[PDB]
Amino acid sequence: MSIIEMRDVVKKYDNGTTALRGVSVSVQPGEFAYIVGPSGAGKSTFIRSLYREVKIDKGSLSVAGFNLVKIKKKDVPLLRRSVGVVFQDYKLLPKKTVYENIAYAMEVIGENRRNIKRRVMEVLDLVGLKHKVRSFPNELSGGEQQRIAIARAIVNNPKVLIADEPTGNLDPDNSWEIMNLLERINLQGTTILMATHNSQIVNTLRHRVIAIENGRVVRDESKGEYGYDD
Ligand SMILES: Nc1ncnc2c1ncn2[C@@H]1O[C@H](COP(=O)(O)OP(=O)(O)O)[C@@H](O)[C@H]1O
């Protein structure tokens, strides 16, 4: 049974722009999917519908178990606990150390403080930054900051992880390091949806590719090629 089920979804913004124009996508638990397509296609609108920042107008949508057509306002935080998000402009808390940043991601969802030390150190092992446990974000490279943003996003073991252009401002070597981390997270079972314009990553680290244009899925292929010139 699917962890994300989108059927005939429509989203039209108030200025009349139909950003999702009948979108159907079914993602099984543990899948890794790239979301690709030209600027303005609807990738961000698609991503943001998955954590209920965007409300759909028509269609059905279930994410991480939750029916997003029916979900009550007060329960959106429960959906958010199950959906880790690496914002394209993810900003760490500048006056918190790496440890405090990751720990806060647990405290803020109500986790027991008793669970924090073990989990934070486990995720620092995962991302390979145990030695930066006391660093502040400004002391880290861009690639290190992104790895800590990913650590924050997965700290509560969400069912789904969404990453909006996680390598978009990283050089090739750092981009591959972020991809190695996301791949290891996926092998642990976490479902990953990643919006991206990096054809080399998509064409080399082959996964499912969902291409969106003008609000429509135009291609949905296993181990897919990138398919665009930009
Ligand atoms: N907040 C908004 N209000 C109105 N129109 C929007 C808004 N966000 C996006 N759009 C429009 O919806 C379409 C899809 O945008 P977006 O989802 O950001 O695409 P992408 O992420 O692929 O660049 C575009 O025509 C865009 O201008």
Which amino acid is residue 19, in one-letter code?
A
CA dihedral angle for residue 59, residue 64, residue 68, residue 70, rounded to 10 degrees: 120
If you take atom 25 of ligand 1, which residue's CA is the nearest one? 40
Range of the domain at 104: 1-230
Is the Cβ–Cβ distance between 56 and 49 less than 8 Å?
Answer: yes
13 pocket-lining for ligand 1 (C-beta < 6 Å) = yes
Is the Cβ–Cβ distance between 62 and 5 less than 8 Å?
Answer: yes
CA-wise closest residue to 83 among 163, 203, 189, 170: 163
Spatial distance between the Cα atoms of 17 and 15, rounded to a whole number of angstroms = 6
The first and second tokens of residue 212, run together, are: 């969106």
Is the Cβ–Cβ distance between 210 and 23 less than 8 Å?
Answer: no
Handedness of CA 184, 187, 193, 194 (dihedral sign): positive
Orientation angle between helical segments 172-187 and 116-127, nearest 10 degrees: 130
43: left (phi over 0), alpha (psi -120 to 50) or beta: alpha
Cα 161 to its chain centre, rounded Å, is: 4
49 pocket-lining for ligand 1 (C-beta < 6 Å) = no
230 pocket-lining for ligand 1 (C-beta < 6 Å) = no
Residues linked to residue 113 through DSSP beta bridges, in sequence order = none
**Cα-to-centroid distance, 153 and ligand 1 (Å):** 24
- CA dist list (Å): 206 to 47, 175, 202, 221, 225: 20, 15, 6, 10, 8
Please, how many CA atoms are within 13 Å of residue 93, restricted to the half-sphere of its CB? 12
The number of the ligand 1 atom at minimal distance from the alpha carbon of 14 is 4
Spatial distance between the Cα atoms of 161 and 88, rounded to a whole number of angstroms = 13
Spatial distance between the Cα atoms of 6 and 132, rounded to a whole number of angstroms = 40
Report the structure determination method.
Answer: X-ray
**Cα-to-centroid distance, 106 and ligand 1 (Å):** 32
Is the Cβ–Cβ distance between 155 and 185 less than 8 Å?
Answer: no
DSSP β-ladder status, 66-67 and 58-63: antiparallel
- CA dist list (Å): 227 to 26, 105, 143, 154, 222: 21, 36, 26, 30, 13
Is the Cβ–Cβ distance between 130 and 151 less than 8 Å?
Answer: no
**Cα-to-centroid distance, 160 and ligand 1 (Å):** 23
Neighbours of 188 (CB within 10 A): 11
CA dihedral angle for residue 31, residue 144, residue 156, residue 209, rounded to 10 degrees: -10
Spatial distance between the Cα atoms of 49 and 53, rounded to a whole number of angstroms = 6
Structural domain count, the chain: 1
Residue of 14, 23, 36, 44 to test ligand 1 pocket, by largest number of atoms within 8 Å of CB: 44
SS (H, E, C) the chain: CCCEEEEEEEEECCCCCEEEEEEEEEECCCCEEEEECCCCCCHHHHHHHHCCCCCCCEEEEEECCEECCCCCHHHHHHHHHHEEEECCCCCCCCCCCHHHHHHHHHHCCCCCHHHHHHHHHHHHHHHCCHHHCCCCHHHCCHHHHHHHHHHHHHCCCCCEEEEECCCCCCCHHHHHHHHHHHHHHHHCCCEEEEECCCHHHHHHCCCEEEEEECCEEEEEECCCCCCCCC
